[PDB]
Each structure stands twice: as C-alpha cells, then as structure tokens.
Structure to design on (968 residues):
RNA sequence: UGUACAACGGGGUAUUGUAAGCAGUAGAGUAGCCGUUACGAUCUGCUGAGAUUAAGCCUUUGUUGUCUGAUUUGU
RNA sequence: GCGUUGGAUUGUUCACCCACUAAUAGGGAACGUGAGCUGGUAGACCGUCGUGAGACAGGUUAGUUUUACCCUACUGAUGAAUGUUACCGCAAUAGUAAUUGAACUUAGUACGAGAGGAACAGUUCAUUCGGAUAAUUGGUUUUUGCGGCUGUCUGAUCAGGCAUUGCCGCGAAGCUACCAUCCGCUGGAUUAUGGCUGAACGCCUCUAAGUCAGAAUCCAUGCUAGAACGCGGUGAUUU
RNA sequence: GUGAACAGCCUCUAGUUGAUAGAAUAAUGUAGAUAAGGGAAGUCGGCAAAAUAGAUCCGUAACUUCGGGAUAAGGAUUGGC
C-alpha cells in the first residue's frame, strides 16, 4: 500500500549496509567521509555526516541528538555481524561453500576487529569534538 | 565468404560454430552438453577430478554405515504407556 | 543512424519532462528536454523511449557554459522493469543520461556506474568509454 | 513503403515459392502419409490380437406435391 | 540456462521467473518472487526471517557444512569436454543427492530425538493431574460395554 | 468541419457484428486448395486447450541478434488425443454454391457421438443409428450405392470425425463432431481411404509434425456486456463529466439525423469466433512415452503437466501439440488446428526449432520447483515424515 | 443402478510466517534471604510449526446418502 | 488505399515559436438568421460624459436549467409459426485492414578529378493500427487467506467483537497493461505511362479495328455475421 | 477508559433494534480506495486528489506602526520493559 510504496521507491533508495560495512572497514574511507570538502548541494554543506546511518545532518548538535537515539542504535546493532552477501545466500543452498567460509573466517580474524577499532575511534572522535 | 555464396546468402547461411573445435575424438562433433539436471547445474559439478572425490565420499559413507550413524521408559512397560497416552488424548479432547 | 544495429524493443520509462542523472565529469548533473528520435506520431501520446535511445536534453544543473544549450544523447539506465530476451526482467537503481553528438560520439571521455548491455552493444563509443557494463 | 499487395514483392515471393519452400512443404506430406499408413497397420495388428428406395422416395414426392399445391416451388410454377 | 539462487530465500530462480536488481556497484540481486523483492525493498534482515535458508543454517537447522555440499563449486577455469567425463558427472550428481538427503534425514533425527520422552511426561503429568475426568471415562466405558 | 487533428479509427470494422458466436465450436470456413498429385491427407485436427507454459530455445536465426543465443518464449498446450472417423460427405458444385448430396456413416458408433446427437441422454432409449446399422446388412447395397454416388459426383470430400473426450479429464462426457476435408487426389481413393478408416483412429502425429505453421480457429472467452472504453479502446472523459465519463461524449458540432454503425457503442465483448494463423509447432509429444517435458539438454524425467496439474484442467495423459504464443480461446475449450492455406515464404517456417527446457512448475501460485522430488530435496524432511 | 452423482474426509499443490501449552536460567536490572529465590518487554526449544487450501485448483481403491417429479409434441 | 504529431505563449492567438517526424496537405457535413460539453441581468469600484436621475470610448471583479422512462435510429439479446426433434453444412447479401521507417548484404561497388555516394534480388527488426492471450513481470485484494498494530470491551491466558472494509506487510485465483506476450496473405482486371502490328493520309503514326506490360487502385482469395418468410444432406420418429 | 479535551473510538445505566423484502453481481452511475515508471507533458486555470499535521528539543529571514511577522522557514525524536 501507500506507506511502503511511497517510502521504498527506487528513487528514495538508501545505501545498502554491505557498502557501509566496506566503508567503515578501513581508515582512509572513514577519514575521507569525516573530512568531506564543502559541497554547496549537500544538506550540512558536507560536514556532519553519519556513516552508520548514511545521512547528512545540518549541524553538530543535530549530529549529537541523532547519536543519542535509537535510530542510530538500530543501525549499529545491525552492522555488528557479517553483512549477508549473495555468498551467504548461496552457501545456504549448497553453492560455493568454501568461499563463504573463507569470507566468514576472514571477517572473524581480520576485518571484524579492524572495523570495530575504526568505529571506536569514530565514536570517541565525535564525542570529543561534540 | 564463398562458402556462404555457395550454400546461401548472408541472411540464410547457418554457420556451424562447431567444426572448428579441437577435441580428443572427432566422431563426437555433433554432441551437446547437458546444462540442467533435476535441480542442479552440470557446470557446477563438472570437474576432471570428481570420481576420486566420489570414491572418498563413498569410503566415508561406508565407514558411517558400519558405525552407528544410520540407526518404553522405565517404570512403565508398554501398555501402561499406551494407556497414559490415550487417557491424555481423551482429556485434551 | 550512428547506431550499430536494429530497432529493438525494450519497455519505455522516460517520457518528455523527465529529469535524469549524469554522472560523468563533463560538467552536467541533469537532463530534461523534449525530443526522442525514432518516436511515433499519435494523438495525445507522449514521446517516451529507451533501448539506448537518443534524446534531446538540456543541463538543468551543471556548468553555465553548457546550460542553455540543447544537446543529443543516450539513455544508459532506466529504473523501469525491462525484459531481457534471455530470461529475466532487469532494472537499475536510477535513470542515467549521458551526453554525445549525433554520430554517437561522446563529449565526455569516461562513464561512471553501470551501463546497459543493449545500450553498449548499440552504441560503440559508449562501450569504449564505459569501464562497467551491467 | 511497399504494400502487402505490391506486384513486385508478390512476384519475388512467387519465385521463392517454387524453390526452397515447396520442397520442404512436399517432404512433410510424404512423411505424414508414411505415418498415417502405419497408424492404420498398428490398429490392424491390434485387431488381430483377438431412388434411394427406402423413404427418400415417399418423402421427396410428398415434398414436391406440397410444393405444387402451395405453389411454393422455385422451378415449377 | 542457469539456476540462480534468490538473494533472500536461497531458492532456485529458473529462467523466466523473478526479478533482478542491478546496484551501482554493478552487483546483481535476483529474487524468486515479489515477496522477496519487496522484503529487500523494505530492507528486512533475511537472517531474522524463519522462512529462509540462511536463518536455518545459522540457527542450527538442516546442516550447513558437509562433504556433499562442496561439489557444486562454481568453476571459472573450464575443461576440454570429454563426454565420458560428462556421463560420469551425471551419475555422480544423482548419487550425491541420495547421500546428502540421507545425511539430512539423520540430522533431523538428531534434532528431534528427545521429544517422545517429553510427550510422555506431558501425558503423565496430565493424567496424574486430572483424575476427576478419568472417573467419567471409566463409568462411560463401562456403560458402553454393558450397552453392547 | 475538418476536425483540426487527424487520428486513426477506434476499432476494426471487419470484425463485425460483435455478437455472440452461434456455436462454442468455431466453424472452419476454408480448407487449403487441393492438389490431386499428392497423397491423401487430412486438412485439420481437433483439440482441447490446456493452459500455457514457458520454454527456452537455442535460436539458429541468421541475420538476427539472438543468432546462436538463448531465448525464453511462451507456448500453448493442446490436449490432442486420437480422433475417430465415423462418416463421409460429398459436396457437389452448383451455380449457387456447394451442395451436399450424400452423407454416409459407419456401422458402429460410440456413446459419445450418440450423446452429441441427444440432448437428454439419461432418459432416452438410445435408438439413434439402429436402422442404419441394419442398413449395414449382408452386402450393404445402400452403403455402396451412396459411396459410388460420391465417387461419381460430388467433387470434393470431407470426413466426419469425433473426439475421445473420455480420455481428457474434462467433465463433459459428450464428444464434438466435425467435418475435416481430404486434400489428396483421386476422389475414388479418398472414399476408399475413408471406407478403410471407419471405426478407426487418426493420431496428431499423422496430421502434423514439428516446425509446421498451423492456424487455430476457436471462440474467444466471453466477458459479457461491456462498455465503449474497454470494448473499442476509447479515451476516458476527465472526471465528473455530465452523464458519466466512460463513453464517447458526442459526435462534434455538425448535425446528422441518425446514429451510424461506426460510432463505437456498448455491448458484448468476447465469445467471438476467431481465426489466428501461422503459429509454429514446437513439440508433438506422446503419452505412451514419458519424459515429454524433458529435453536433450535437460535429461530430467518429467511430463509437461505441471505440479498440481494445470489450472482449471487436469493432467496430460495423451498426445499433445505445443505451439508458440497465444491462440484464441481459454482453457477447457475446443479448437481446430488447420494447416496454413498457402506456402509461407518466411524462414520462420523453415528453422528447425530446438528446445532446451520446459517449465513444469506450479501455475497455482509462484512456482519455484519443477518436480516434487526437487521440492522434497530443497525443503528437506518435515515433521510428518519422521 | 453405474469404473454414475453429490456431501464429507484423505493426498498433492499453493499462501502466510513458526501456533496453543509447557520448560530454560538466556534475560537490562530491581527487591527479599545467606551466592540464592520472586518479578520481569524479550530470546531459545518442542515448531517451515500452526492456520487456510475452490468458492471458476489437480487427484481420489475411503465413509455416508441420492437417482421415474411436471408439461407438451405427429408427416 | 493508408497516415497526416508532441509542446511553449492569455500585458491575448482572426496567430506565431522550436522540435520530433515518412509527413507534420487543405476543406465540408454547424457558422446560407438561431441548436452538445468548455473558456471568452440584479451587486461594487476607477475613467469619459451628464445640472441630475443615469448613460457609456472604456476597464476590473463576483455571479442556480435540472430528458430518454416515449417513437425512430444505433448497439447487443431472445422468440411464435412454416409435421416434431436433433446433428453436420452451403453461402445470396453486407462489412473488410493493414501501415510506415530503419538495419545487414548488394558495396565504400556502379557514378565521380575529388568531396562524396544509390538501387533491384536475398535477409533482420521496429513505428501506427487491429485481434487475441494470461507462461512470466507489474498492478489490483472482502480469499476479509496468514501474520502483526493502536484504543476499548468480553475478569487474566486462549479465542474474539467494535472502529461506516479500522490500520500495516505479504498475498494466491480471477481480471488486467505495447507496463506483459503472440499473430496479422495472394490471384485476375486496370489508370497514368512505356510499347507491338497497323490504317486513316501511296510517308509516318501506341489507335481508329486488334494487342503486351504496368500503381499502395478495382474485383476476387482470405477474415466477420449468416437471409430470424434462403437452401441442402443426415439420425430418431411416441404401448 | 484513551487523550490537553463535553473532540473522535469502545463500554456501563436507560432506550431502540424503526426506515418494503428476496435472488444474482452486466454496463453506465453515486459514495470511497489502490496503482509500476515519469511527475503538471493535462487543463482557460495544478479544479479535484495527494502530501503536511499531535507533543519534546534545536533553530527561525526580510519587513515592522517595535506591539508583531512566527507554529516563519528548516532539522533531531516519539513503542515496550
Ligand atoms: Zn546513524
Ligand atoms: Zn526468495
């Protein structure tokens, strides 16, 4: 009906948590988006961009009130685990099992704590500047 | 070009994409590879070394068949258990 | 003409009066205007097309040197439900736009994001300027 | 364009018909007759597993006399 | 022809069935039906929905790792087309499916053992709970056998 | 005045009057021209429409852009059990038209065709062809005299056949009856063919084969009294116009004194008799041989009938014809397959169609599995099993 | 008065999304009792369970019952 | 024969502007008083005039006709009587539909100093139109099928009621979309025109008598209905 | 009872269950509702419909008769335990 039709249009489509995982993974990606040069078209003129909830706020205090909220915590509690790729979708059906398991142990060993440390640095950076 | 001119023109001549291919046996020129079986796809299961892995699979299955892989409560004999079961079913109904 | 191949039929998504995205760095952001080449003529019907279709357009957002200026170019993404004659229905995230001359040659030199399979097969220079097909 | 009922296109089609298409159309007839005869022979093999003088005369003379009394005949007055 | 797996349901997507979505990363998401497509649009989590296979394999339902499930590897390096090799693979697939189905049935038995003990204890508690209906049962059985 | 803007008509004036057809079974109005050089051959066949399905094909079409590429296509499936011959008709030429001067029937006939002749079968004494069977006595003087009449006169010969509805899952019990023309030569040989073929069957393989372009004649799916907008294709008036918006507003400014036959009014939509030509047969499948739905590429033993059977139809336990696309008529109807009336100068009627796969999934929903074995294997063992 | 017809039921197919009831220590903490007990959204298990499935789906070795009311027609 | 568009502009349009297109031809059946549907009297203000009431060279604004159930026409639907009933058919008459563009090849050939650059024959696909269809995709939901949500009520659980279909999600079947798919022909006579023989007129002449080709034209094949007072062949004919 | 509320929704007391009925579910209507992609290309004219909407917090321009404009605008949230 109207709610789903007029919220989840492909025009108003958002940014597919897989990619947010791949972005919060590494240092350079998070620093790039924290820097984010002045763009006249973006809502907050660039700055004040939440990466978990891929969203431009207007101001620092609007970032504060966003972070002190359940809409942020929804996404951070959704983004802790693995990102559910087609690898998972086909390993469930019995197809490219070893690729899925290599990806799983890779995240468990390498990429997981990488992203966790990046998130912690992000959090204390934001809490210190704000 | 001229084989086309002989058989039939540009838009009619059906070229065989085969007849150029390089094989162990030439008598099998006009064969076809199955793509799909019951649910599966042949290209996914098709390795050169499949019979050996199947031999290992059968070894494992025969080990398990010898093992215990494919195989009353005290106080009540069996008819006591059936009586309790039927009484409970009656009670629920 | 300019295109290599036949007039093939894929569903219509982009009527007249539709603002679609440009992601190359020729300078434009948007494409609007009227015209579709190879469009029919029927009372009360809108000119709307795709299939790597060539269309007239202006930059609504972009650099002023190419604003105020009508230009031809080709649809590469649609976001309507198109059917491939090999199986499934396809559709993109969005519409996409981008710029060229009447022979099919591009003002820009590289494309961002995916480009349609049939659009690239129909327009050579799009296939050369595209790094990502589908 | 050239219409469906254009003389030149129809002549070209007429020239094409006598050749590659009629051969394919005629082969199928022999094939299907060869199948039709075997579908008879198999039925036989299964079987071997075990005036017009009656009423037309009266009806027609009565029709003609009704026609000639009511004067409702096409040929006769 | 191929048989793809639904991004959501992990189900087969035969030719002429479903819808495909092409992200901006040049990544394909094909679905078995509009149910899964619309769940993707609404950004549901298939590892939380009980009717997928991902939930099952992650929860510890029908098993995930086994020797049977390694044969359907995708193959990006081809081979010379030996028809003997093709014929061997055709029999191998049928054999592998029998073996996998038997192991699956065994996994389900391992999961569902310990249920008859529980059911029997339920019935014991119930009958030892409620004797006042057992009197009605006794008298009615006696009445019926005296009636017949 | 001159309308200010030209636009084409709304509707076709050749498919008029748009009335209910006078019979559920559309009547064949033209058979191909006879060549007396060629063997004896039926011009047509009867069948029952049974749903639709989807196939994949490998296309060897030179010049096209799917040349040496795969293509998904829809197909229609007609249950075509063998057809039984029961009679002959001879049609003499006159300067009024064609006239039938004699019809000859067989010795024994089935309860099906007798039911066709009857209208209350459960009360009757079923006395239909008793005296004709008696006329089939010692030498059959009458039978031979009328057959010789047909050999002498009558010009062209048609054969009365009926179906074997008993074989279908349809709940009708009553067979259809149809004249089908014989297009070989030698009227004597036509009559001899029929005489030898009384009380005997003709399969569909003996009338058609793959890569053949046939015509379907049928009746199209009545919807009932319908309005202008959906019955001709007119525009709709914007909103809250006077006396409604799903109609033609008027004729214009100018003044006639009558309403014309050309101005798109309301009425019946459907149950019209239609003749749709040039549909390519893709498979002549047989009930005797299972794995009809299977293919050289598939090698997955299964019949064409999908899981749960077709919808508003049962299973295909009989010989069937698969054609591509969309024929007239709905499921559970009677269609006549004719062969093409003319040699077709298109390469489409030459290309040897090869299939790769057929869809035997459920049409009672969104089907994901081709076989119940596949469903069993994917779902795994349930609670009920063990 | 038959491989007859129907109402129920069985099987298949499809839609939904894991029933009622019972248990656990899994449960942000809070009180009481010398770590333990009571409350507790929720989670986990019996459970792709449970429900619906022709009313214009397919199929049926089952159970039960039904099958001569009225009118009219002649070359 | 078949088509002859989409839009901008009301400090206005008895029109013009830029695009697409094969093309964007003109007109009539109303305007030879007056006739579908839609824009363009009563109140009030400014301007010119008037002694004034008021009028106007003006301009602005707001401002209730409401068939058809009758006859005919048109569209679809029955039906008496022509021994009864049933089946298979014929076809007078009437209607008729297909259309346009591009692409491969012919060929970078003919042609041309160069620049440039065709076509017949053989093939492929699309535009407009029409007729069907529902395998798939999409839409639709009183399947009120499944689940959930708010508020309240049935003591709580269960199971439910009410909220003018309470709301949200999925939703088969059916219906439906160039928003999906399929299909859409071939014989005779002719116009203009080009010709053969050949007088008129001891030359000559396509014409006067004869005669060969030839257009998307005409008539038929094919498609639709089937004369309810058009017809045939055939089956049964009453305890 | 919910809730800011004599709003709207459900209920207790008291009262009523009155308005010609039955069978089907064609078109056209009357009263509503949903719709892919595009979003005013429609039309004299965005008529009508849609969208927004309560409460907490941040923040709020020109102009101003300094009293207002102003809920300007524009943004972050809302359950249960
Ligand atoms: Zn966030
Ligand atoms: Zn799925």
């Amino acid at each position: 009906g109207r709610y789903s039709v007029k919220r989840y249009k492909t025009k108003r489509r958002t940014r597919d948590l897989d990619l947010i995982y791949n972005d919060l993974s590494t240092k350079e990606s998070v620093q790039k988006l924290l820097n984010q040069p002045l763009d006249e078209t973006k809502p907050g003129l660039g700055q004040h961009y939440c990466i978990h909830c891929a969203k431009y706020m207007e101001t620092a205090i609007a970032l504060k009130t966003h972070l002190k909220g359940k809409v942020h915590k929804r996404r951070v509690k959704e983004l802790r685990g693995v990102p559910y790729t087609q690898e998972v979708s086909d390993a469930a059906a019995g197809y490219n099992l070893n690729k899925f398991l290599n990806r799983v142990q890779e995240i468990t060993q390498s990429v997981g704590p990488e992203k966790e440390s990046n998130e912690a640095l992000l959090k204390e950076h934001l809490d210190s500047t704000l | 070009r001229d084989i086309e001119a002989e058989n039939g023109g540009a838009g009619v001549f059906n070229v065989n994409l085969k007849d150029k291919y390089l094989l162990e046996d030439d008598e099998w020129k006009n064969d076809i590879m199955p793509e799909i079986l019951d649910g599966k796809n042949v290209y996914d299961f098709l390795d050169p070394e499949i019979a050996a892995k199947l031999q290992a699979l059968e070894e494992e299955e025969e080990k398990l068949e010898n093992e215990g892989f494919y195989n009353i409560y005290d106080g009540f004999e069996a008819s006591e258990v059936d009586d309790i079961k039927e009484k409970a079913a009656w009670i629920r109904n | 003409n300019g295109a290599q191949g036949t007039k093939f039929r894929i569903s219509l998504g982009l009527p007249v009066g539709a603002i679609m995205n440009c992601a190359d760095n020729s300078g434009a952001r948007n494409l609007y205007i009227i015209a579709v080449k190879g469009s029919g003529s029927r009372l009360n019907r809108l000119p709307a097309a795709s299939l790597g279709d060539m269309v007239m357009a202006t930059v609504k957002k972009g650099k002023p040197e190419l604003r105020k200026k009508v230009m031809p170019a080709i649809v590469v993404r649609q976001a309507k439900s198109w059917r491939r004659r090999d199986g499934v229905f396809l559709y993109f995230e969005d519409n996409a736009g981008v710029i060229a001359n009447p022979k099919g040659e591009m003002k820009g030199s590289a494309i961002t994001g995916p480009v349609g399979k049939e659009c690239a097969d129909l327009w050579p220079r799009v296939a050369s300027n595209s790094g990502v097909v589908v | 364009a050239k219409s469906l009922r254009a003389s030149s296109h129809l002549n070209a089609k007429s020239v094409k018909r006598r050749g590659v298409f009629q051969k394919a159309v005629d082969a199928r007839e022999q094939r299907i007759s060869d199948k039709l005869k075997e579908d008879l022979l198999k039925q036989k093999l299964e079987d071997l597993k075990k005036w017009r003088d009656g009423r037309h005369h009266t009806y027609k003379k009565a029709k003609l006399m009704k026609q000639s009394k009511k004067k409702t005949s096409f040929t006769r007055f | 022809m191929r048989i793809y797996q639904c991004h959501f349901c992990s189900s087969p997507c035969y030719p002429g069935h479903g819808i495909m979505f092409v992200r901006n990363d040049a990544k394909e998401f094909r679905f078995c039906r509009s149910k899964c497509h619309k769940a993707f649009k609404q950004r549901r989590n298939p590892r939380k929905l009980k009717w997928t296979k991902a939930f099952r394999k992650a929860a510890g339902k029908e098993l995930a790792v086994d020797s049977t499930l390694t044969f359907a590897q995708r193959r990006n390096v081809p081979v010379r087309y030996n028809r003997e090799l093709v014929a061997t693979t055709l029999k191998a697939m049928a054999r592998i499916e029998e073996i996998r189905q038997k192991r699956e049935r065994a996994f389900y038995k391992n999961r569902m053992r310990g249920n008859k003990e529980k059911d029997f204890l339920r019935d014991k508690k119930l009958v030892e709970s409620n004797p006042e209906l057992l009197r009605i049962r006794e008298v009615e059985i006696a009445r019926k056998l005296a009636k017949e | 005045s001159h309308r200010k803007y030209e636009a084409p008509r709304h509707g076709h004036l050749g498919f008029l009057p748009r009335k209910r057809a006078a019979s559920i079974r559309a009547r064949v109005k033209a058979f191909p021209k006879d060549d007396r050089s060629k063997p004896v051959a039926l011009t047509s066949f009867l069948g029952y429409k049974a749903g639709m399905t989807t196939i994949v094909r490998d296309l060897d079409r030179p010049g096209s852009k799917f040349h040496k590429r795969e293509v998904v296509e829809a197909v229609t499936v007609v249950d075509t059990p063998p057809v039984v011959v029961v009679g002959v008709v001879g049609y003499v030429e006159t300067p009024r038209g064609l006239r039938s001067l004699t019809t000859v029937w067989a010795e024994h006939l089935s309860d099906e065709v007798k039911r066709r002749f009857y209208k209350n079968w459960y009360k009757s004494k079923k006395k239909a062809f008793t005296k004709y069977s008696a006329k089939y006595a010692q030498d059959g003087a009458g039978i031979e005299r009328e057959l010789a009449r047909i050999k002498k006169y009558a010009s062209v010969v048609r054969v009365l056949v009926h179906t074997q509805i008993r074989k279908t899952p349809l709940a009708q019990k009553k067979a259809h009856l149809a004249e089908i023309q014989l297009n070989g030569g030698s009227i004597s040989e036509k009559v001899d063919w029929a005489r030898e073929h009384f009380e005997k069957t003709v399969a569909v393989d003996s009338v058609f084969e793959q890569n053949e372009m046939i015509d379907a004649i049928a009746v199209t799916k009545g919807h009932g009294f319908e309005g202008v907008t959906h019955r001709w294709g007119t525009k709709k008036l914007p909103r809250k116009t006077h006396r409604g918006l799903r109609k033609v507003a008027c004729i214009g400014a100018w003044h006639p004194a009558h309403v014309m036959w050309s101005v798109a009014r309301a009425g019946q939509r459907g149950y019209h008799s239609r003749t749709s030509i040039n549909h390519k047969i893709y498979r002549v499948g047989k009930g005797d041989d299972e794995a009809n739905g299977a293919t050289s590429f598939d090698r997955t033993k299964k019949t064409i009938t999908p899981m749960g059977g077709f919808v508003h139809y049962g299973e295909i336990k009989n010989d069937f014809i698969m054609v591509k696309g969309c024929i007239p008529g709905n499921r559970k109807r009677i269609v006549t397959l004719r062969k093409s009336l003319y040699t077709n100068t298109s390469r489409k009627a030459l290309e040897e169609v090869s299939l790769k796969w057929i869809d035997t999934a459920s049409k009672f929903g969104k089907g994901r599995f081709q076989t119940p074995a596949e469903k069993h294997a994917f779902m795994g063992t349930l609670k009920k099993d063990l």
Q: What stands out?
A: Residues A 50, 52-53, 55, 66, 72, 75 surround zinc ion (ligand 1) (CB under 6 Å).
